[PDB]
Amino acid sequence: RVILLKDYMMREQLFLRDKRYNHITITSENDIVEAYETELNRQVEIKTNPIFRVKP
C-alpha cells in the first residue's frame, strides 16, 4: 500500500512497463491529488490510425 501524504504534490510522471503489480494499491490521505508542472516532459507516441502524441 503506497500512501501519499497530505504534503505531496505530484510533479513527476510514473512510468510502469511490464510490471505485474496486481497487489499494489495507491492511496492518498487527501481526497484529491493535485498535479503540477512535471519536471521532465516524457511523451509517448501512440501509433494508431490517428497519430496523437500524449504526455501521461
Add this chain to the structure above:
Amino acid sequence: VNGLADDIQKMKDTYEALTLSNTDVTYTVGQKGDFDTLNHCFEHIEDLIVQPKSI
C-alpha cells in the same frame, strides 16, 4: 521536572518553526481537518515566525 521538560519541548518547537522555511505545507479546513474554520487557519499562519516555502 515537568516544567523543565516543557521548556525543552518549546525549544524543539522553536527550532522546527525556524527550519520550516524550506518546506511546504498543507492545512486542511473542515470538521476533521487540522483547523476548525478558515479564520483559525489564517490566524495560525499569521503567527508563524518564518513563512514556509509554499502553504
